[PDB]
């Protein structure tokens, strides 16, 4: 059974159709199943999807907004649209708020999965963040700081600065700090420290985590060149 | 395999837009070959596809195609080997003798329309560059193609070339166009063209490159001048300089054209012609 | 003029439209191109010499040294080094992976430079990507500019005032030849714009079109322009405005080069810091 | 107002959304008014997006059905997903029709128009005849075949050889019927005949229309070396 929901998910996925595999993974961890690496990583990726080409919509929606202010009511109508899409944007984030408070939080035996479960809750609030102004983003920003260090901890603790699922958080929290807090010194440095403990816990990985872990780190880098600018 | 180091270079053939043949020996082989360089900055991954697309050059073998040992790059330059020519180009001839007589002109129309067929038939490939500089002679007479697109990539590499003064280009392949052969047939009548009479016939009796495509394809096709040539030479040349690509002669037309069967029956010795007019 | 015996020739770099280049060592590192002009007119060399006497007296960051000419290993010129791979190179041969603001600012030296040789009435034809170098990792240095006099051959005393050099950054009314001077500013932002294109597209225009004639015919006629299409998405929106105005047919649709790095200077300004950061992949 | 409708199913293009947009512009159709030949455009590709998406779906799972080649669950899941997707696409093209055949075909004063709007219906009676396997097949394919000829003999009629609607409708009835019909010969032939008709009238070819012109027939040349093979 499980396994069939399983393929479900994958051929939903390989048919490009992800609110298909969104809702498919959406029934399986509402079981509160034994979660492995794969099926939490296919629940990731799908969300990931779904709420990103919103996201990029909403950012692009924004940017016509303020394309030209000196016209007639056109703004009204487009600013009216943009609350649509935040409706269609905040509520999907929020199920997946309440999902991940509902099993997978407190259905975690290993310390790794509660640094990634932790890491994408602070993840999707910080996507909410962007949406959220006034008292509404404090809020949720309070929400993702604590996640995020409560993920940091653990993930120092427990895993190798080479780890890529700590690589990625390292990554995200400079992310947030740079966008919604706007404090690039400390994005900076704890980039920086983040890649140099990289870099000094280099060549003992494992065979398969050669792409994954450099793809990180180059994108590390990258953010560095950005940010030094 | 072929590398840099075994080639000795004797001399330069020639030098055209894209590069620069030079005619070399073989060092391992102690044989005389004509080496092309093409230089060009491309990804590594295209210059390996253009290496292995070359490679098919390999079983292309035939009495009007040119010969060819191998195909490398060295630093930024696709290098090609093929047989040496000894009678080089006709357009080489052409600047030998004023005009090439009408015999030895039915016998290299003969030839191109035998390696066109040989190709199109063989490879399934279009030489899309049928002009006198890539028409090559021997001294033992015989007449061969070389410079005909095998490599796709390659092509799409040189698209990435300085201007030109003179074209081959028919009016449909200008016009963003293609009709298979047709158009290779225009080339080859149009160096015939070019190659009866003592000139490019192009702005008929200097232009620039845009001008020469402008009037080749807004233009009637050019002619040969009558009364200095039989009637079937320029009904052939009528044939092959045709706007529209349908009412272009596709091969086999041509083949059993009037003026092809009356070169075939005639005994020409192009030899001994081509080794008076070069020396 | 220099003295050959001066300069020593390393080994030999490439060819171009109208040299070959060769490493030398003349008072520090330099290029030597070497022309193909076997013979050249006296009319032609003393023009020769007035254009290179004009382009030693230019003194700009973003574009290189021009050092001077030599007559004895055949006719010569001496420019400065550039140990920074072309911009071609970058783009296409190596399609290294520029961030969106290291493009505007290869842009923004890139018309800073063209600006100065336009304020001194040097018009750089041949003026494209492989004719940029990224100097000390993002400088833009500009070379092979001016020097009309040679890259087009000479019927004795008079120039063929015929087109030369690569086609893609060539311009439409140049290509045409429809004047006996049809290179001028225009020309040049023409140029500019093609390879502003490359740029925001990391693409050659033009990319359907695989024969050189067609590609002359098409543009020549007008029935081919840089489809705006390949552009980026993260691309700002002015700076498309800008491309799109830069490779006019009109030749004096074009904007001028001061309004060029005016555009650029506003699009630096309203540059946010927002889609610049990059999240964790779905590794 | 018209305008504001047009601009927001223009914005939600922009935004790479394909739903609101095809929402937007069915609900401009339902007002009954004739579309300018600016509008039209949009219309043709929402839904034809909206339509590719599902196509590619369907054909990545019928490749998937076809590949596992087993005995399981797996296959009877993919053949339920397969119809699930198939009859998602049966309602957007009849929906499509529906929108067509009420508002737009029978009030079309522009002939031009009318081979328009005959192209996209045959279009989309093949879409959903390529799908559709059984007796049901034969009433679309002939639907399909009715008014690809329509436009076909308007097309001959009072039609440029060279203008990019006529090239297109050749190219899709020459698709048409080698696909559906299974006749290459007739194919080749329909192919051949367009490709003469517009070369014959290349040296009409204004800026309005030239990339497409050639696109077209760089389709057509493709297609036919693709036949004679
Ligand atoms: N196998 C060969 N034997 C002798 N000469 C050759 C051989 N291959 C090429 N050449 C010479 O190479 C010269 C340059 O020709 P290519 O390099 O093919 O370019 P092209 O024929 O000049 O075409 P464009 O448009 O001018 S670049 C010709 O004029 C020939 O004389
Ligand atoms: N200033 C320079 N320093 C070092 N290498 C150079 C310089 N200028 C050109 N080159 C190299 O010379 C080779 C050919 O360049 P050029 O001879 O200038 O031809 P091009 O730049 O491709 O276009 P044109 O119009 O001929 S200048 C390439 O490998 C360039 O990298
Ligand atoms: O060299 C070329 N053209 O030179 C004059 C302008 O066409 C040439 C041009 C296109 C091309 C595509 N694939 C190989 N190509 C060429 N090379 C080549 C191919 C076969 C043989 I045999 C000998 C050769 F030199
Ligand atoms: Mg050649
Ligand atoms: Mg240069």
Redesign the interface.
């Given at each position: 059974d499980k396994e069939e929901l399983v393929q479900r998910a994958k051929l939903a996925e390989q048919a490009e159709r992800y609110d298909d595999m969104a809702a498919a993974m959406k029934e399986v961890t509402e079981t509160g199943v034994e979660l492995s690496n794969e099926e939490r990583n296919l629940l990731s990726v799908a969300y990931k999807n779904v709420v990103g080409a919103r996201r990029s919509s909403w950012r692009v929606i924004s940017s016509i907004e303020q394309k030209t202010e000196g016209s007639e009511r056109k703004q009204q109508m487009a600013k009216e649209y943009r609350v649509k899409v935040e409706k269609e944007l905040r509520e999907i984030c929020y199920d997946v708020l309440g999902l991940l408070d509902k099993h997978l939080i407190p259905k975690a035996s290993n310390p790794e999965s509660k640094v990634f479960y932790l890491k994408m809750k602070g993840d999707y609030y910080r996507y909410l963040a962007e949406v959220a102004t006034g008292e509404t983003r404090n809020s949720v920003v309070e929400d993702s700081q604590k996640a995020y260090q409560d993920a940091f901890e653990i993930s120092k603790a427990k895993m190798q600065p080479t780890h890529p699922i700590r690589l990625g958080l390292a990554l995200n929290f400079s992310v947030f700090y740079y966008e919604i807090l706007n404090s690039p010194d400390k994005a900076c440095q704890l980039a920086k420290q983040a890649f140099d403990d990289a870099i000094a816990e280099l060549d003992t990985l494992n065979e398969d985590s050669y792409k994954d872990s450099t793809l990180i780190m180059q994108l590390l880098r990258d953010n560095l060149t950005l940010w030094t600018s | 395999e072929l590398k840099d180091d075994d080639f000795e270079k004797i001399s330069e053939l020639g030098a055209g837009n894209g590069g620069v043949v030079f005619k070399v020996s073989h060092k391992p082989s102690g044989l005389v070959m004509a080496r092309k360089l093409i230089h060009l900055e491309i990804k590594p991954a295209i210059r390996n596809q253009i290496i292995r697309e070359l490679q098919v050059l390999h079983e292309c073998n035939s009495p009007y195609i040119v010969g060819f040992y191998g195909a490398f790059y060295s630093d930024g330059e696709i290098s090609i080997c093929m047989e040496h020519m000894d009678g080089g180009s006709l357009d080489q001839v052409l600047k030998k003798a004023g005009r090439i007589p009408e015999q030895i002109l039915g016998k290299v129309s003969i030839a191109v329309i035998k390696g066109l067929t040989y190709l199109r038939e063989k490879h399934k490939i279009m030489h899309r560059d049928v002009k006198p500089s890539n028409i090559l002679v021997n001294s033992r007479g015989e007449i061969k193609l070389c410079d005909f697109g095998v490599s796709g990539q390659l092509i799409d590499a040189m698209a990435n070339a300085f201007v030109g003064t003179r074209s081959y280009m028919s009016p449909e392949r200008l016009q963003g166009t293609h009709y298979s052969v047709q158009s290779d047939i225009w080339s080859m009548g149009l160096s015939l063209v070019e190659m009866a009479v003592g000139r490019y016939p192009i702005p008929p009796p200097p232009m620039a490159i845009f001008e020469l495509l402008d009037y080749i394809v807004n233009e009637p096709p050019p002619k040969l001048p009558s009364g200095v040539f039989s009637l079937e030479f320029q009904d052939f040349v009528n044939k092959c300089l045709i706007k529209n690509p349908a009412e272009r002669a596709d091969l086999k037309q041509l083949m059993v054209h009037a003026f092809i069967k009356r070169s075939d029956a005639e005994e020409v010795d192009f030899a001994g012609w081509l080794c008076s007019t070069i020396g | 003029e220099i003295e050959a015996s001066e300069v020593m020739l390393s080994t030999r770099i490439?060819?171009g439209?109208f040299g070959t280049v060769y490493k030398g060592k003349w008072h520090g590192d330099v290029a030597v191109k070497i022309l193909k002009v076997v013979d050249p007119t006296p009319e032609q060399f003393q023009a020769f010499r007035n254009e290179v006497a004009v382009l030693r007296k230019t003194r700009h960051v973003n574009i290189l040294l021009f050092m001077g000419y030599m007559t004895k290993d055949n006719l010569a010129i001496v420019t400065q080094w550039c140990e920074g791979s072309s911009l071609?190179?970058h783009l296409?041969?190596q399609?290294t992976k520029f961030?969106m603001?290291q493009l505007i600012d290869i842009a923004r030296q890139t018309a800073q430079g063209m600006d100065y040789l336009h304020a001194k009435n040097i018009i750089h034809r041949d003026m494209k990507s492989?004719n940029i170098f990224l100097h000390e990792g993002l400088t833009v240095k500009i070379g092979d500019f001016g020097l009309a006099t040679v890259k087009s051959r000479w019927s004795g005393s008079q120039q063929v005032e015929?087109?030369?050099?690569?086609?893609?950054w060539?311009a439409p009314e140049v290509?045409?030849?429809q004047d006996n001077n049809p290179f001028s500013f225009q020309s040049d932002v023409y140029s500019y714009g093609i390879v502003l294109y490359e740029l925001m597209t990391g693409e050659?225009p033009?990319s359907?079109?695989?024969?050189?004639?067609?590609?002359?015919?098409?543009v020549?006629?007008?029935?081919?322009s840089p489809?705006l299409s390949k552009l980026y998405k993260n691309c700002p929106?002015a700076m498309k405005r800008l491309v799109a105005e830069c490779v006019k047919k009109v030749k004096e649709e074009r904007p001028l080069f001061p309004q060029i790095l005016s555009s650029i200077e506003l699009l630096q300004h309203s540059l946010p810091?927002?889609?610049?950061?990059?999240?964790?992949?779905?590794?």
């Open positions: - | - | 490439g060819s439209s071609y190179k296409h041969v399609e961030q603001f492989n015929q087109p030369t050099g690569s086609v893609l060539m290509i045409r030849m050659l033009y359907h079109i695989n024969n050189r004639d067609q590609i002359i015919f098409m020549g006629r007008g029935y081919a489809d929106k810091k927002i889609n610049r950061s990059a999240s964790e992949p779905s590794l």
